[PDB]
Amino acid sequence: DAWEIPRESLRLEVKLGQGEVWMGTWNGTTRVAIKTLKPTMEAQVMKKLRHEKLVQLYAVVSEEPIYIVTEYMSKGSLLDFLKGEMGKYLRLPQLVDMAAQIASGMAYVERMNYVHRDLRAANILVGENLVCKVADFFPIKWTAPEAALYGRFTIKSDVWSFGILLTELTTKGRVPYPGMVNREVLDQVERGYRMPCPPECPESLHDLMCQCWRKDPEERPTFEYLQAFLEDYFTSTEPQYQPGENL
Ligand SMILES: C=CC(=O)N1CC[C@H](n2nc(C#Cc3cc(OC)cc(OC)c3)c3c(N)ncnc32)C1
Secondary structure, eight states: OBOOOOGGGGEEEEEEEEOOOEEEEEETEEEEEEEEEEEOOOOOOHOOOOOBBBBBBBEOOOOOEEEEEEEOOOBBBHHHHHHHHTTTOOOOOOOOOHHHHHHHHHHHHHHTOOOSSOOSSGGGGEGGOOOEEEOOOOOGGGOHHHHHHHHOOHHHHHHHHHHHHHHHHHHSOOOSTTTOOHHHHHHHHTOOOOOOOOOOOOOOHHHHHHHHTSSSGGSSSSHHHHHHHHHTIIIIIIITTTOOOOO
């Protein structure tokens, strides 16, 4: 109830998505993102979870029409950012740094004993200075098989999805498993298949993806390990990295 805000304190300026979400002004002073719920149905979670790489809730209005006020992320979704005009310029150091920020946020989710259940670039927001924050808004291609088949949604299954998100980073937003329909992916991931090394992407990084894609959930690394691994990627793992045409 301390999060409650008067309806007149919000100005909805630019519509962004559609269950809409707007760019707006709160107290005529603050740039904010406003998500609208149409008069379906909440975010007790967002009031507890506070972390540098979790996008923060600012205020709420509880009675229909409901409005969720969160901080503004100037670059939109990471999927849009990677696919858009900035993709051409991102190289591995940039992409690995974003992946470390996401792992960092997810490691906070790991410490809090929460699960995301839907980690992928579409649910990562990007801000100024390549800041990336994980955000909570049929994703078989991103879902760990034991979660997709039996509903075991662990932080372990989120790790599997981080592994897939690393593929989105290194292909600059391309859908994983190119040319495979949903049923084709389920069947082949159980037969042991996994995405190959993306072009120009070091084998050290692809190996990290494979640790994320281990069939045994308890064998995949923690987010604490992933965060640390990516934060020193270019000193401990690829000290010889030389820029390329795309990575
Ligand atoms: C479906 C819309 C969608 O995916 N996007 C991505 C960009 C845009 N969007 N969407 C934003 C959002 C949001 C959001 C709204 C929420 O209300 C529960 C909860 C939540 O968990 C983090 C995130 C957003 C933002 N905060 N700042 C800038 N742009 C934002 C619309």
